[PDB]
Amino acid sequence: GLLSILRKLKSAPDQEVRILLLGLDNAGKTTLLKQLASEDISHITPTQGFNIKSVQSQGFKLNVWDIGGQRKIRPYWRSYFENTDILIYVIDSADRKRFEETGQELTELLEEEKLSCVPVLIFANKQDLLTAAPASEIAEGLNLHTIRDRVWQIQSCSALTGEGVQDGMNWVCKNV
Ligand SMILES: Nc1nc2c(ncn2[C@@H]2O[C@H](COP(=O)(O)OP(=O)(O)O)[C@@H](O)[C@H]2O)c(=O)[nH]1
Ligand SMILES: [N+]
């Protein structure tokens, strides 16, 4: 007893919500996953180099994996895009060196036909760090305001402390 966020959620959806939690390695996805659900994590490997962490919790199905990396594993990623209801993209706000890379990865994801119209929540993570870049600047750097083909939101959070995570999930629940 020391409750996960998916459970605390008020006005939670009615149908099972399929969520994809993506971002670069070290972004804080596993840490975020554990703040969201306490259920046991399943580790699935559809193809070599494609490592998925999957959890079923509180009417939510979450699949988590690191983006970027190898070329030939895109067709395997795409199979999951088709039935995705929400995309949660996680960024390490203190990793300026890889901001350009993660921005490009996000841009490419939003170009995927299979992800058309899927709402996207961007978590500007690790905001507890005194090295974390400002969320308003991250948003401009990701050119989020140019997004016209879907609804989006950027939320400052700390998966470590849990701050801002529920606020982000509240937005997700309003846009399912
Ligand atoms: N200070 C701080 N560290 C975090 C936060 N979220 C994750 N981390 C740390 O970042 C590292 C990578 O996190 P992890 O969840 O395993 O990343 P994943 O590779 O994206 O699954 C670990 O050392 C975490 O403890 C945060 O909000 N604040
Ligand atoms: N801008």
Side-chain angles (χ1 to χ4, degrees):
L2 234 193
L3 314 177
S4 65
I5 299 178
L6 293 180
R7 195 185 177 188
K8 294 197 230 268
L9 291 181
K10 296 296 182 181
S11 181
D14 334 289
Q15 71 282 57
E16 186 179 64
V17 179
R18 296 170 236 85
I19 306 182
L20 287 188
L21 192 55
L22 311 181
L24 295 177
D25 60 292
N26 198 237
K29 304 183 301 299
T30 301
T31 303
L32 171 63
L33 176 61
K34 291 177 181 170
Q35 283 278 13
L36 298 175
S38 60
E39 288 66 27
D40 290 302
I41 297 168
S42 290
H43 300 81
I44 307 176
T45 313
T47 191
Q48 187 165 101
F50 183 22
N51 309 303
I52 302 171
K53 287 184 184 184
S54 193
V55 302
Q56 170 66 72
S57 168
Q58 305 304 314
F60 295 85
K61 287 191 118 99
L62 315 192
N63 284 295
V64 187
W65 72 80
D66 301 330
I67 40 66
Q70 308 121 308
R71 58 174 192 189
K72 193 179 181 179
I73 69 173
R74 296 294 188 290
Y76 297 87
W77 288 4
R78 301 202 183 89
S79 291
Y80 288 81
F81 296 166
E82 323 190 313
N83 204 0
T84 299
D85 299 309
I86 299 292
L87 170 61
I88 297 179
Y89 198 76
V90 188
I91 293 171
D92 176 342
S93 302
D95 194 333
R96 284 183 181 288
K97 291 182 181 179
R98 299 203 292 168
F99 185 61
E100 179 180 58
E101 167 168 39
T102 199
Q104 186 56 42
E105 288 291 324
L106 177 57
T107 294
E108 284 172 24
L109 283 178
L110 306 188
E111 300 184 324
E112 289 291 328
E113 169 183 295
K114 296 302 177 182
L115 288 176
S116 72
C117 303
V118 176
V120 57
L121 169 69
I122 296 81
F123 265 133
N125 197 39
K126 311 197 186 181
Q127 283 293 320
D128 55 292
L129 292 170
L130 297 177
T131 48
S136 180
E137 287 185 9
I138 288 174
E140 301 193 84
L142 297 170
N143 276 123
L144 300 183
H145 293 89
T146 65
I147 298 177
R148 310 273 152 220
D149 66 332
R150 74 185 73 238
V151 296
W152 64 273
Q153 183 77 182
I154 182 169
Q155 175 68 53
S156 173
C157 73
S158 171
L160 181 62
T161 70
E163 195 172 322
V165 180
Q166 194 170 326
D167 289 326
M169 292 317 298
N170 285 330
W171 180 84
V172 172
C173 289
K174 292 183 178 182
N175 295 270
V176 166

